[PDB]
Amino acid sequence: TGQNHPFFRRSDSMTFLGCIPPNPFEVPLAEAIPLADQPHLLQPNARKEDLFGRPSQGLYLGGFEVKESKFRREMEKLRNQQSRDLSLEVDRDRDLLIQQTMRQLNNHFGPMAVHRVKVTFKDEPGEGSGVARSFYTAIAQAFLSNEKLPNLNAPLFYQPGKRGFYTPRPGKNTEARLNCFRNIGRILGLCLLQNELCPITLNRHVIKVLLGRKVNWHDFAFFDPVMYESLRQLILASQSSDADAVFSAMDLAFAIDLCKEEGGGQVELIPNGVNIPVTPQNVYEYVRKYAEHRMLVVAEQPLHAMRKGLLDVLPKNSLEDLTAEDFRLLVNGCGEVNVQMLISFTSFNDESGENAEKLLQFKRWFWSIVEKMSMTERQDLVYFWTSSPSLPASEEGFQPMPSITIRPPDDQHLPTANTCISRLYVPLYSSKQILKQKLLLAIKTKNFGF
Amino acid sequence: IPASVIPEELISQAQVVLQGKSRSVIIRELQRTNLDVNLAVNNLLSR
Amino acid sequence: MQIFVKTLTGKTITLEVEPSDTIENVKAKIQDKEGIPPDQQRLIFAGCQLEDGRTLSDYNIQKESTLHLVLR
Amino acid sequence: MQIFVKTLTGKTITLEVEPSDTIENVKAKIQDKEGIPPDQQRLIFAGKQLEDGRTLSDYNIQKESTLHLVLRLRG
């Protein structure tokens, strides 16, 4: 049609019923989608109105907890329906872990009827329940870094412009990289099916390809914000009072050059020549073809392999009526660690046998030390406790419902972690600096044992 | 057997014997074993 | 140096232990003081059953811990 | 005479060792150097585990040698 082609329209996942959506060109990024410029507002107790802005009035069924609870009973029904297991022997490094994971994940899943996966690294007497979480965060950080690929060699992800969000690169894709893209959605599928957390983070166009929903123009704001703004003022300048005194001197075309993560350069969008100039009356065709080529054309086979790998685990009926945001909440959790929620997930088991005001003064020191701690050390402490670098967003995320306990007082004993399910053991000391030094010395170790 | 007709003493004993599992575990214990605590705890330790 | 092995009813027996003790010595002491056969009981330490091969140090059962006991 | 103790964070403090002592003397030396009790300590080096029943000279270790200290603390 014109400017109102079905690419520039808000989908069902970002609108409210009976309200006219705003115009997608006259409003900046902060006042339209406040989740684009900063992504830390995704919380379990977060309203949808403060995530996608205020809708316009028409005269001028549930939320998170309904979806995730029904999804959790459907996953445990599917889990108890099957009774075939999977054992894993991994190596705590990057290259050996990646190679061993993709050679031991081909024997399985090649629908599927797995039940439970057990994890052991090597020479470690720590076979419990946190080994699966440790394996999931190990494969996530193995595929999350950018060094190389240890044969079967470009990296499998890049960062489109926001830190922490990862989008795949083809990199002259071949018969091995496509299989490595196929066997990475299965890890996310098992994380969804076993009710855990895996630290792999994707942009919403990657997820919306996997779920089976069409990608629109507003999903480009979560991809590249500065290019979104540049094309926004290009469209607004294309409908000025004159619009020909600035497009005759800009000298654009329908040809594209690409960066190192996409390939070469000088690719024609529409055929039969790159010599056409962009007159103002087909600027929307240029914007749509540019965005659609940047998402859905160069990354066609990695996204296709990821969707095939995701549907190789689960049947194609459970992901219906599931948005990308609660998809992120069931997998990535809350992201950063908030200490108030961590206070709300404790019990204070007492076994010290001391009457220093019947305890209840050592805990103020502990919480002051925890609240006066750095963010990386906070993730280190949470990984020290539950073998996971972030906390879930609900009571139902934890199977053992974690706890700390106080031991008989020894001044020389640094704190220990019974992390095979959830528990932390803390000896009692005197004063503050002793506890500070012992705990900040203890929480830098991630090696299991016992 | 309705879930509310049982006292909380049996579920508290099962919790302090076996912890780290769900309320549905005690539901399946009540629906199947018919109050045989040693056999049920041995079966849940056999998995 | 005390371990309270609480039973199902509520009674508590007394034990004197060592952190370096092996489960072969556990079978030795339960045939010494008690005489109960070892194929009729199971033990719980924080939701984690022990094994005859690993020692108490491999399962982190130090001085003044909590242990359970469930008959077969 | 001196050994090379390294950890994850990069701390390195020199130790004094007898040429013909035992492994428990090494563990006593490192607990006296910092304050890490040896019940949570472990020494793994050169692809093998070491038990305190054998001497430090049984395992063919020279002077200014390297050793990796692994803290068995979690489980």
Author numbering:
A (entry chain B): 2016 to 2075, 2215 to 2264, 2271 to 2312, 2501 to 2798
B (entry chain J): 180 to 226
C (entry chain I): 1 to 72
D (entry chain K): 1 to 75
Q: What does the published report state?
A:
UBR5 has key roles in stem cell pluripotency, tumor suppression, oncogenesis and other important pathways. We used chemistry and cryo‐electron microscopy (cryo‐EM) to visualize stable mimics of the intermediates along K48-linked Ub chain formation by the human E3, UBR5. The structural data reveal a ≈ 620 kDa UBR5 dimer as the functional unit, comprising a scaffold with flexibly tethered Ub-associated (UBA) domains, and elaborately arranged HECT domains.
An 8.3 Å resolution cryo-EM map of the resultant UBR5Dimer~UbD~UbA complex largely superimposed with the structure of UBR5Dimer~UbD. Local refinement yielded a 3.3 Å resolution map resolving elements defining the configuration for polyubiquitylation. In addition to UbD and UbA, the map also shows the UBA domain and additional density around the active site that was not visible in the other maps. The UBA domain binds UbA positioned with its residue 48 at the active site. With the HECT domain in the L-conformation, the UbD-linked catalytic Cys is situated not only adjacent to the acceptor but also at the junction with the N-lobe, which is thus also poised to contribute to Ub chain formation. An intermolecular hydrophobic core is formed among UBR5’s F2732, L2762, L2789 and A2790 and UbD’s I36, P37, L71 and L73. UbA’s K48 is guided into the active site by interactions with UBR5’s LOL from the N-lobe, UbA binding site on the C-lobe and C-terminal tail, and by interactions with UbD. Among UbA’s lysines and the N-terminus, only residue 48 is fully buried by the catalytic assembly.
